[PDB]
Design an enzyme around this catalytic site. Structure first.
Site, PDB file in Angstrom:
ATOM      1  N   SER A 215       0.242  15.660  -4.725  1.00  0.00           N
ATOM      2  CA  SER A 215       0.453  14.435  -4.212  1.00  0.00           C
ATOM      3  C   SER A 215       1.789  13.914  -4.712  1.00  0.00           C
ATOM      4  CB  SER A 215      -0.657  13.446  -4.838  1.00  0.00           C
ATOM      5  OG  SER A 215      -0.401  13.274  -6.159  1.00  0.00           O
TER       6      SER A 215
ATOM      7  N   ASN B  67       3.835  14.962  -7.811  1.00  0.00           N
ATOM      8  CA  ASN B  67       2.914  15.180  -9.008  1.00  0.00           C
ATOM      9  C   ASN B  67       2.653  16.655  -8.794  1.00  0.00           C
ATOM     10  OD1 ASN B  67       1.857  12.096  -8.422  1.00  0.00           O
ATOM     11  ND2 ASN B  67       2.701  12.684  -9.822  1.00  0.00           N
TER      12      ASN B  67
ATOM     13  N   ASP C 210      -0.114  17.797  -9.052  1.00  0.00           N
ATOM     14  CA  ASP C 210      -1.356  18.121  -8.073  1.00  0.00           C
ATOM     15  C   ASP C 210      -1.200  18.039  -6.547  1.00  0.00           C
ATOM     16  OD1 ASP C 210      -0.835  15.473  -7.186  1.00  0.00           O
ATOM     17  OD2 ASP C 210      -2.479  14.715  -7.862  1.00  0.00           O
TER      18      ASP C 210
ATOM     19  N   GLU D 140       7.968   2.077 -13.773  1.00  0.00           N
ATOM     20  CA  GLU D 140       7.614   3.072 -12.826  1.00  0.00           C
ATOM     21  C   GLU D 140       8.711   3.622 -11.955  1.00  0.00           C
ATOM     22  OE1 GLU D 140       4.753   4.429 -12.365  1.00  0.00           O
ATOM     23  OE2 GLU D 140       3.307   3.227 -13.479  1.00  0.00           O
TER      24      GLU D 140
ATOM     25  N   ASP E  10       4.116  10.118  -5.469  1.00  0.00           N
ATOM     26  CA  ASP E  10       4.079   8.650  -5.713  1.00  0.00           C
ATOM     27  C   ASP E  10       5.444   8.093  -5.056  1.00  0.00           C
ATOM     28  OD1 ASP E  10       1.989   8.839  -7.567  1.00  0.00           O
ATOM     29  OD2 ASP E  10       3.180   9.045  -9.222  1.00  0.00           O
TER      30      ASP E  10
ATOM     31  N   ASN F 218       0.376   6.234  -5.011  1.00  0.00           N
ATOM     32  CA  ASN F 218      -0.001   7.629  -4.707  1.00  0.00           C
ATOM     33  C   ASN F 218      -0.683   7.858  -3.400  1.00  0.00           C
ATOM     34  OD1 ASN F 218      -2.230   9.948  -5.366  1.00  0.00           O
ATOM     35  ND2 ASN F 218      -0.454  10.233  -6.436  1.00  0.00           N
TER      36      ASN F 218
ATOM     37  N   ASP G 179      -9.562  -2.380  -7.854  1.00  0.00           N
ATOM     38  CA  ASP G 179     -10.309  -1.221  -7.638  1.00  0.00           C
ATOM     39  C   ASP G 179     -11.022  -0.690  -8.631  1.00  0.00           C
ATOM     40  OD1 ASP G 179     -11.389   0.247  -5.386  1.00  0.00           O
ATOM     41  OD2 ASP G 179     -10.064   1.909  -6.026  1.00  0.00           O
TER      42      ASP G 179
END
Length: 129
Positions: free
Chosen positions: A50, A46, A48, A35, A52, A59, A101
């Site tokens: 957002s 990203n 969209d 990562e 990371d 995120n 989660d």
């Protein structure tokens, strides 16, 4: 801060990640390698909106607050800038909430794609811990 592989693995083990939710150490080490390439300071934007953050690339839409992502939820309750720290406690702590989660490690895309199903053990070789 750029960690060494076995130095990160030590640190993860200390924090409880070896076999947390059933994912042995080497799954964590492998995730952080792909990562963020062990670099704490790593941030990726990203399409969209957002972003990371950090070694585990957490995120901003759902886990930490950057003040700049529309519709953010901040479930780990912490500012995103604290996940760019050279001490990993805060990213570890948010990562134990993400893994529990309901998708396992599947939340991390580079783990999914480079590490799931592989011989993961292989990422603690040469490690004394």
């Amino acid at each position: 801060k750029v960690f060494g592989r076995c130095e990160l693995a030590a640190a993860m083990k200390r924090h409880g990640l070896d076999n947390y939710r059933g994912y042995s150490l080497g799954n964590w080490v492998c995730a952080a390698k792909f990562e963020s390439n062990f670099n704490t300071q790593a941030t990726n934007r990203n399409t969209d909106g957002s972003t990371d953050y950090g070694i585990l690339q957490i995120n901003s839409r759902w886990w930490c607050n950057d003040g700049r992502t529309p519709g953010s939820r901040n479930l780990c309750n912490i500012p995103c800038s604290a996940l760019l720290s050279s001490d990993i406690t805060a990213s570890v702590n948010c990562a134990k909430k993400i893994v529990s989660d309901g998708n396992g490690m599947n939340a991390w895309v580079a783990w999914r794609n480079r590490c799931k199903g592989t011989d993961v053990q292989a990422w603690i070789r040469g490690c004394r811990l």
